[PDB]
Amino acid sequence: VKNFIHKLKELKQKSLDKFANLLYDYGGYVYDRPCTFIICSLICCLLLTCGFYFKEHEKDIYKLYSISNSYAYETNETINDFFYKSRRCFILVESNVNLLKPKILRELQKFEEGTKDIEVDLSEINECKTNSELPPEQSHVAKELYKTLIQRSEENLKSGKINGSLFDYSDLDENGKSVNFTDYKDDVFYPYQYIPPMLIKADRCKLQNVFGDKNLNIDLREASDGLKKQITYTLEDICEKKYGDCNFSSLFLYYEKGNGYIDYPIKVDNLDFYVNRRTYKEMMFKGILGNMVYEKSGSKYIIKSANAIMTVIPLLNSHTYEPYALAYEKKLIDYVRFYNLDDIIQDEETNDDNDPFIRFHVFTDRSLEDEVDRISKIDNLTRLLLLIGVLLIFMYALFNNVTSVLYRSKPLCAVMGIFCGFLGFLSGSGFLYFLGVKSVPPAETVPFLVIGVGVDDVFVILNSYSLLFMVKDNKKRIQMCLKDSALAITVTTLTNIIAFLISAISPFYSICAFSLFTASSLFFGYLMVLTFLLSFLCIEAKLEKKKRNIFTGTFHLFRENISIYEWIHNLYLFEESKYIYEEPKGNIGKYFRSLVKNYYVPFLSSRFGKTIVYIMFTIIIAMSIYGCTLMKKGIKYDKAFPVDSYVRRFTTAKIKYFPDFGDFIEVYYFDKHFINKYRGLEKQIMNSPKINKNVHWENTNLQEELINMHNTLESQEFVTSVANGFTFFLNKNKSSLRKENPQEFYEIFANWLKKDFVGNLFKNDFVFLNGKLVAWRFHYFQKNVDDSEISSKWLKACKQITKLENHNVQMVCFHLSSIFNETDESIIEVTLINLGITILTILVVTAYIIKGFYSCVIIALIIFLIDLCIFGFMCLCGITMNIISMVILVLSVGFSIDHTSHIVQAFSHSMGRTRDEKMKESLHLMIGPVLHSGLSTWFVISTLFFSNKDFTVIFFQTLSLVLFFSITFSSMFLPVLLSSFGPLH
């Protein structure tokens, strides 16, 4: 075993060496034929760039920023498959004046009516393109049933008789039972006007299906564009209709039918649920108007001021009407966003002591996805930010690669060093595009980072070259240089790539892509450095030999071997006691080094210095610990969208003027049997099999639990208001419900829904199959709150309230934010797992390149300590541990390992007798590269700080912390730690 270990250590070294020797020779080849390498590398890069032609973006927010658990998603599916939801467009008008003033009001009125005026031509409908693929045929049985149901629906509706006598109310079997079609046949749904949405799949291409009055019977997919242009539909055609009239929620409902008059003040009996008597249509003034100012007279309030008026337009959500709806919404959003009434408000007084203003915000279902498209493209701002960053790093590079002796200085390399990285980004991206990898919104930051990381290798190479001033034959110098820095530049990259790849495994596609693209970019960039940049180094080197400055060479063109460690050691020894030990004036890094040797190192060596260092880092870690205590997770999905987004702006306004009406949480109940049955025709709660298998809704106690639940949820502070029809029904006619007869229950509830005014309002929240309430629902408003954590807290509580365990009844609380927030729960662990894998993998790699084992252990300690610091301080800075932040933390390992490793490897390879000696040598030889690498990266990413997109700024903040601690520890703590307890001999 000992012999085996010996042989192994022999292999590692031997191999590590061989690799170096190989690069040593490769350099020679490039040195002799620099042009060939540059031209070929560039052309090859271009080809990859061509790949961009196939660049396909990804715009499904859910895939981009959600686990896609297939659970909450499944919930949406179930909800949509059986319950008819309704597309709702929200239009809010905000101002600093009393929009209630008659003159303004009248204008606002036309604004509203304008919506109805909006008209969409058929040609606009993209879905029903003049040439498309007909949707897959709906299962035959499904078709049959749809035919049957639609037929009986009419029949029943005509009859109007609600009779449950025939319905068998026997408890269903485990199979839900108590010839597929026959089974699905003979099913009476109530309300009769309901047919399971899933079964509703008729080709919407035939206009006859969607809009009947048209009487056209014209297939849009088979119609001329001009012909389609001819036909035009309006909101009324695709709007939910109350009492045969679009069910808007505008204030103007009050004035309808002369119930009230714009010119006169608004006086209503109840601000909560006033009803226009003439129209018999109800309205919630509190919901419609914001910042209301009302008086009280004869029990009738006198609304006399409001600086916000919101109108909700309800549009059908049926599959058939889906394509058409989207079209109208698009027209609507444009219309509202550009509508302006500044003229009327010009002289009207303000309450904000600011210029009279009026703004029309609008939010439709298509809004979110549309905004995703906007975030998909590369904002000009981002572009600009990149440019600034590139300039910064360009300046920094040059400012460090230029000197008094121009021919000695190597500006060319620096310049191309930057490009090298960029070209890498393009080439890599193109390669991935070729592979089909879709781009993501977070990819905007990829260029920024890639460039920064790449330029770092440039510094390293140059450092080796410069420190090899002794060498006379340039070819040899370049060769030796590359040989010296080969392992370093290779490992550094390898580590980075590895980390990103490991991260790519993330479920969230955004992270996956961002990482994948970055990793590929880094890879190709490295290749470019070994080719392009190296070739440029060769050219400049050759010029230096001739002492020909770049410009000089241009006009003109138009017309031994010693370990650097050995040398540096000898230098110090010699110092302790010539040309070899005197860097030529203008060596690329001559100054900085001198500064480090004559100032920084002395300080570090100083006991007082050390004292300071240790204490400083001490407190740093301490602060980090407290930071961890203040750890908060989660970020609102909307944050993704730029703040400027009208969506974001809309939400803000709503919150400001309508705080109570925040999240419209919706709770649903879905009999497992019913769901399963119909789900079948179209070939967590599931925890317990009998969770919702069979519920006797006639059980008075159960009924009582229901009303109690309503009361409980109402009590909850976060809940602002609830609308549970069942409660209304139970309270309305509990006496009749006293007798617990299943059939009786069905009939009573059915009639209640059919007749009672309130009941009619809740007609679409209850569905009965064969006399049994297979599914139902109720909704409640949850006050708006920013913290994702507290939000989830509230929702989770709601779930508890909605779980009649005694009667085996568990209802599902649903909200859009649910899926996104759901991810927050597991973010804490997944990160640990990923980080762990990364750390390990990276450590293993370093171990194979770090000579001493003890040095490896030192590195690990440093890495972990940094990570604690970067995490602790992110929490301390308030950076929530969101997806964006976490990935950066996990990825941080790569950056940190690089800087730490360089110093460590040097200290080990030092020939210094005393530990301190080694430290000084290591620092004098690698401190420059380390500093340059980190700083360069930060400079490029600095501009991201001014990015509108929230996720971007988080990226900047987190990475800035990473880089900071990395460089800090690598340049300060690590040195002193090694100087005190470092591997010796």
Ligand X SMILES: CC(C)CCC[C@@H](C)[C@H]1CC[C@H]2[C@@H]3CC=C4C[C@@H](O)CC[C@]4(C)[C@H]3CC[C@]12C
Site residues for ligand NAG per CB under 6 A: 141, 161, 163, 165-166, 179-180, 683
Give residues 863-892 in contact with ligand X (rule: CB under 6 A). Answer: none
Sign of CA dihedral 418, 421, 422, 424: positive
Please say which residue, 182 or 598, places its beta carbon nearer to ligand NAG: 182
Angle, nearest 10°, between helix axes 411-435 and 380-401?
Answer: 140
Q: What is the helix (H) or strand (E) element at residue 89, kind and residue range?
A: strand 87-95
- Can you give the length of the chain in residues? 985
Breaks (C-N over 2.5 A) in the chain follow: 178, 559, 577, 683
Nearest distance, CB of residue 180 and ligand NAG, angstroms: 4
* Residue 179 contact partner, candidates ligand X, ligand NAG, none, CB within 5 to 8 A by sort of partner: ligand NAG
- Residues 615/437, Cβ–Cβ less than 8 Å: no
DSSP string, 579-594: GGGSPPTT-TTHHHHH
Smallest distance, ligand X to C-beta of residue 118, A: 23
Looking at the Cβ atoms of 728 and 873, the one nearer to ligand X is 728
Site string for ligand X, 763-782 (x = CB under 6 A): ----------------x---
From the list ligand NAG, ligand X, none, pick the one residue 762 interacts with, judged by a Cβ distance below 5 to 8 Å according to partner type. ligand X
Exposure string for 501-511, b = 16+ CB within 10 A, e = fewer: bbbbebebbbb
Q: Residue 543 has which token pair?
A: 């010029």
Distance CA 967, CA 518 (A): 22
Alpha helix (H) residue ranges in 756-816: 757-761, 788-801
Binding at 163: pick from ligand NAG, ligand X, none (beta carbon under 5-8 Å per type): ligand NAG
Distance in Å, CB of 179 to ligand NAG, minimum: 5
Between 588 and 681, name the residue whose CB sits nearer to ligand NAG: 681
Among candidate residues 458, 484, 345, the one with its CA nearest the CA of residue 396: 458
To ligand X, the closest distance from the beta carbon of 784 in angstroms equals 17
Do the beta carbons of residue 326 and residue 51 sit within 8 Å? Answer: no
Burial class (CB in 10 A: 0-12, 13-18, 19+), 16: middle
Task: Give least dist CB 146 to ligand NAG, A.
Answer: 15
Q: Per CB under 6 A, does 621 bind ligand X? A: no
Residue 815, contacted partner among ligand NAG, ligand X, none, CB below 5-8 A by kind: none
The C-alpha atoms of residue 312 and residue 301 are separated, in whole angstroms, by 23
- When the beta carbons of 166 and 505 are compared against ligand NAG, the nearer one is 166
Site string for ligand X, 709-738 (x = CB under 6 A): --------------x---------------
Q: Which candidate, 320, 369, 391, places its Cα nearest to that of 127?
A: 320
Q: How far is the CB of 779 from ligand X (least distance, A)?
A: 5
- Binding partner selected for residue 761 from ligand X, ligand NAG, none, CB under the kind-specific 5 to 8 Å limit: ligand X
Q: Which stretch binds ligand X (CB under 6 A): 148-156, 758-766, 814-822, 920-928?
A: 758-766
- The tokens for 766 are 């209850």
Which of 42, 388, 758, 816 forms a contact with ligand X (CB under 6 A)? 758
Least Cβ distance, residue 666 to ligand X (angstroms): 8
In the complex, what is the shortest distance from the CB of residue 760 to ligand NAG, in angstroms, rounded to a whole number?
21
* Among 554, 540, 553, 442, residue whose Cα is nearest residue 886: 442
- Sheet strands (E) in 304-388: 308-315, 358-363
> Based on CB atoms, which residue is closest to ligand NAG, 141 or 471?
141
CA distance 748 to 956: 62
Q: Which residues 243-282 are close enough to bind ligand X by CB under 6 A?
A: 273
* Residues touching ligand X, count (CB under 6 A): 6
- Beta pairing, strands 812-814 & 663-670: antiparallel
Closer by beta carbon to ligand NAG, 163 or else 760: 163
Q: How far is the CB of 683 from ligand NAG (least distance, A)?
A: 5
What is the closest distance, in whole angstroms, from the C-beta atom of residue 776 to ligand NAG in the complex? 23
C-alpha to C-alpha distance for 734 and 757, rounded to whole angstroms: 17
- Closer CB to ligand X, residue 241 or residue 793? 241
Contacted entry of ligand X, ligand NAG, none for residue 687, CB cut-off 5 to 8 Å set by kind: none
Residue 653 dihedral angles phi and psi, to the nearest 5°:
-60, -45
Give 165 or 175: the residue with its C-beta nearer to ligand NAG: 165
Q: Which one of ligand X, ligand NAG, none is in contact with 758 (Cβ closer than 5 to 8 A by kind)?
A: ligand X
Nearer of residues 348 and 682 to ligand NAG, judged by Cβ: 682
Nearer to ligand NAG, 184 or 509 (CB): 184
Q: Which does 615 bind (CB under 5 to 8 A by kind): ligand NAG, ligand X, none?
A: none
> What is the spatial distance between Cα 459 and Cα 466, in angstroms, rounded to a whole number?
10
Nearer to ligand NAG, 84 or 169 (CB): 169
Looking at beta carbons only, is 769 or 839 nearer to ligand NAG?
Answer: 769
273 binds, among ligand X, ligand NAG, none (CB under 5 to 8 A by kind): ligand X
Exactly one of 184, 469, 749, 762 binds ligand X (CB under 6 A); that residue is 762
Structure tokens at 706: 């229901």
For residue 65, CA distances in Å to 377, 810, 829, 948 come to 17, 28, 18, 18
Strands (E), 699-846: 719-723, 766-769, 772-782, 803-804, 809-810, 812-814
Q: Strands 274-276 and 281-283: what pairing?
A: antiparallel
Binding site residues, ligand X, CB under 6 A: 273, 723, 758, 761-762, 779
